[PDB]
């Protein structure tokens, strides 16, 4: 079962969505690259 | 912990807005980490 | 079997230190064999 | 396969764990010692 | 077709055994036809 | 160049415990490259 | 310049037929003018 | 030195099946080195 | 020693098809070593 992106990045997905970043596939993509860092994925999301 | 219990407040809002499909709603909500705002946007395109 | 998964723990630390550039980080990390300590040094001299 | 970072991964790590951060130097040293950390170390400590 | 590449596995063994001198090692190995066993003996007199 | 020329013979000799290069080349030149022959040479002179 | 070099291909044939004695071989070959065929015959009677 | 002196001739003779060294040198000395002549000699004694 | 003494001449004679040693030496001794002369001798006895 271990694991599953929605479950794994729950807390982060929430913050991103809280900031207007609604695109799941983009968010997961960004977050995997930042190792789970919201701070990092944010930066990624703001430049593609 | 349990989806119906976990997303109660949100499921309600979605259903109020006419989004009656449970499976879709839970799917949407898991993806948005529980954000109604986000799941709405998701539901409105797939 | 896949950089984001392979260097997860390290990507996180780098991102937690403000090093947001994925391509650079993976490059630096491959070169240091996964050592954060080493990739950091690389990243700080554009030896990467 | 057939790619230095992949090929000398385990050694590169040990060198880096010892403070030897210069990639090009390490690969150079490792190629010469045939992969031996023990040998590359000695190389790196005199050129 | 290049000593470091050709004698890689042998060079490694020699080096773990403390035989750090590349030129000596290749010299010893060419003479032993690639045999570590042989190059060792050579290096210990050689 | 002897090491290159008698490479795979030198290997066999070395892989039988005959580590002396000069002796091996000497023996091999005499046997015209034959491992079989050089062996015999090495076992008496 | 030099028997081993001069009679290389012949020495090899002799050796691969079991005729291991270098001095005998060269002696035989010099007499047969290089002919393996001839030196063989010589070696089989002295 | 006969082997050295009659090298190219000894080879031809040997390559015609005339393996007896002493006979060949004997025949060649008599023919002044001529293979053609030593041949003829060898074919009648 | 005739083979050694008349080497160069024996060769020429053999080169011209005169293979009989005894005849050649006989002819040469009489001509004092002259090929030209022994030839003539050999062509009539």
């Amino acid at each position: 079962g271990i694991l599953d992106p929605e479950e794994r990045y729950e807390h982060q997905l929430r913050q991103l969505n809280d900031m207007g970043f609604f695109d799941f596939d983009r968010n997961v993509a960004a977050l995997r690259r930042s190792g789970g860092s919201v701070q990092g994925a944010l930066d990624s999301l703001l430049n593609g | 912990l349990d989806p119906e219990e976990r997303y109660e407040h949100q499921l309600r809002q979605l259903n109020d807005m006419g989004f009656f499909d449970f499976d879709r709603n839970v799917a949407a909500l898991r993806r948005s980490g529980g954000s109604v705002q986000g799941a709405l946007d998701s539901l409105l395109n797939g | 079997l896949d950089p984001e998964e392979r260097y997860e723990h390290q990507l996180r630390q780098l991102n937690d230190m403000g090093f947001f550039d994925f391509d650079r980080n993976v490059a630096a990390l491959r070169r240091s064999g996964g050592s954060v300590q080493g990739a950091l040094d690389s990243l700080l001299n554009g030896d990467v | 396969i057939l790619d230095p970072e992949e090929r000398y991964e385990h050694q590169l790590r040990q060198l880096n764990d010892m403070g030897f951060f210069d990639f090009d130097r390490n690969v150079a040293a490792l190629r010469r010692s045939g992969g031996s950390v023990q040998g590359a170390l000695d190389s790196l400590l005199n050129g | 077709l290049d000593p470091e590449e050709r004698y890689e596995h042998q060079l490694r063994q020699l080096n773990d055994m403390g035989f750090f001198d590349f030129d000596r090692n290749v010299a010893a190995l060419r003479r032993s036809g690639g045999s570590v066993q042989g190059a060792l003996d050579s290096l210990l007199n050689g | 160049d002897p090491e290159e020329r008698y490479e795979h013979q030198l290997r066999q000799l070395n892989d039988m415990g005959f580590f002396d290069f000069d002796r091996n080349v000497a023996a091999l030149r005499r046997s015209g490259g034959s491992v079989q022959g050089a062996l015999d040479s090495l076992l008496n002179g | 310049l030099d028997p081993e070099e001069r009679y290389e291909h012949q020495l090899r044939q002799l050796n691969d037929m079991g005729f291991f004695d270098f001095d005998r071989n060269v002696a035989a070959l010099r007499r047969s003018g290089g002919s393996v065929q001839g030196a063989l015959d010589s070696l089989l009677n002295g | 030195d006969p082997e050295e002196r009659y090298e190219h001739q000894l080879r031809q003779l040997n390559d015609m099946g005339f393996f007896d060294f002493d006979r060949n040198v004997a025949a060649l000395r008599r023919s002044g080195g001529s293979v053609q002549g030593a041949l003829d000699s060898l074919l009648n004694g | 020693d005739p083979e050694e003494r008349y080497e160069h001449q024996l060769r020429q004679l053999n080169d011209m098809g005169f293979f009989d040693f005894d005849r050649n030496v006989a002819a040469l001794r009489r001509s004092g070593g002259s090929v030209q002369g022994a030839l003539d001798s050999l062509l009539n006895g």
């Binding site: - | - | - | 764990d17 010892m18 403070g19 030897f20 951060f21 023990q38 170390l41 400590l45 | 403390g18 | - | - | - | -």
Partner: protein, 73 residues
């Protein structure tokens, strides 16, 4: 007083050292608790070979850090 990790192969050993003990003391101290004789221990921290007549703290070896041990000779 400092407390340092030591590494070889896939081995560890802990040792105690006063900040201003020599590197030679530091070597003895390892030895006393791991076998490898002093004259065989080559010690590497931060890209440097630790030399015998230097203070352990000259290398700024912090508490809880690993100093590597390459056995030699």
């Amino acid at each position: 007083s400092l407390n340092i990790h030591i590494k070889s192969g896939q081995d560890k050993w802990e040792v105690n050292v006063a900040p201003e003990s020599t590197v030679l003391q530091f070597k003895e101290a390892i030895n006393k608790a791991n076998g490898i004789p002093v004259a065989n221990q080559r010690l590497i921290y931060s890209g440097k070979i630790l030399k015998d007549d230097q203070t352990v703290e000259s290398y700024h070896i912090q508490d809880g850090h690993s100093v590597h041990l390459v056995k030699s000779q």
